[model samples]
Target chain A: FSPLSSQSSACCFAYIARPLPRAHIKEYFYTSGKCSNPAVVFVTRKNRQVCANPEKKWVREYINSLEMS
Target chain B: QSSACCFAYIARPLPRAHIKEYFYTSGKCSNPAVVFVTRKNRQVCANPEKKWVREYINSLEMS
Candidate 1:
């Protein structure tokens, strides 16, 4: 199948500089194609979704550390 | 985080009570699937064709 898939309507224009605890994050995904700027969507333990710039080293680390599947 | 896409899926459906939210795989992934998050923070995968899966997604949409 092609890469086409559903994406959230809301895109992140601003990102939080503060890094959240790894334990608090449940999953993360890239909003590269769906948004103007690439962002990492992090879903927390409380079901809150936060957007972070994918370029941030700490953000990349968090994305690499969490389990997605 | 684990691979952005789900490589394998659970044949059995998860409890509806546990499914809190969900997101679709990125365009980069070869496999497209619904990644459902549970109350306990489990990233479970399900086929989009499943009736229950669509129902859960619809419920989340209304929220």
Candidate 2:
């Protein structure tokens, strides 16, 4: 697919407040400012991508731990 | 999904200036990909194995 056509727009509408288990998460990254809300997107082992509030303690911890690993 | 599943990678590296951010694809992916979001907000797939790709990611992450 052409890069332009396949590109995703701002994906998150609402943020999940509950912390996802670390074992189920594969990776996570913050969405760009282009998004309507700043979000931490977590990709799961099953390839499910969910948006998490970046302000949440668990979300920040996951990012810090994963970044160091 | 945050990014489209990448079936393949770009043949060449995008200029660092054009990259706004990047993130690794789900590890469940058969082919691991690094999705780079350009300054224009388009997503470009890249081989995570590339030296330049890693360099760009490291630089962008710190900014």
Candidate 3:
């Protein structure tokens, strides 16, 4: 068993993110819709992995804001 | 199938998106504390405090 009491994760809209030299990314994750809720898994990055969510721009904005902070 | 934007996915070491970049002992992105601001160091996209979610979403500058 994993000694660590807690592991790490995140959620976000689905899409492949691209890192730009502009330095405006940290990381993000998301949940893929299903009949039932599932424990989503995700890792993160810093400095430039921007997700292209042309649909739900809100989710996109949220991820970007994290970089601003 | 629904859009990826939905929230009903599975996580059992499944899918590339499920996994974020690896964090190391020494580096710019190190440890869950500095990396994520929730769950005693686990940086989660969403938290139990639904209020935090609203706050985070609302705090954004929508232009």
Which CAPRI tier for candidate 3?
Answer: incorrect
For each candidate in turn, the TM-score is 0.45, 0.46, 0.17
Q: Which ten residues in a row have the lowest lDDT in candidate 2 chain B?
A: B1-10
Question: For candidate 3, lDDT tens digit of each residue in A1-69?
Answer: 753436433333423322233234344544434312332222335433333333344554555665555
Arranged by lDDT, best first: 2, 1, 3
lDDT of 2 by residue, A1-69 (tens): 224433566568898867888989878878876567889899999988899998889999999888886
Interface RMSD of each: 9.1, 4.3, 10.0
Model 3 whole-model lDDT (C-alpha atoms):
0.32
Q: Comparing chain B with the reference, what is the TM-score for each candidate?
A: 0.87, 0.86, 0.24
Candidate 2 Cα misplacement greater than 4 A, ranges = A1-6, B1-63
Q: TM-score of the A chain in candidate 1?
A: 0.77
Candidate 1 local lDDT, A1-69, one digit each (tens): 112234335578889889988889998877756467778899998998899988899998887778543
lDDT of 2 at A12: 87
How high is the lDDT of residue A69 in model 3? 59
Rank candidates by DockQ, best first: 2, 3, 1
Estimate how well candidate 2 is docked, as a DockQ score.
0.09
Instruction: Sort by TM-score, best first.
Output: 2, 1, 3
Q: Candidate 2's C-alpha lDDT?
A: 0.81
lDDT of 3 by residue, B7-63 (tens): 221112223233332221222221111111333443333321234333333433231
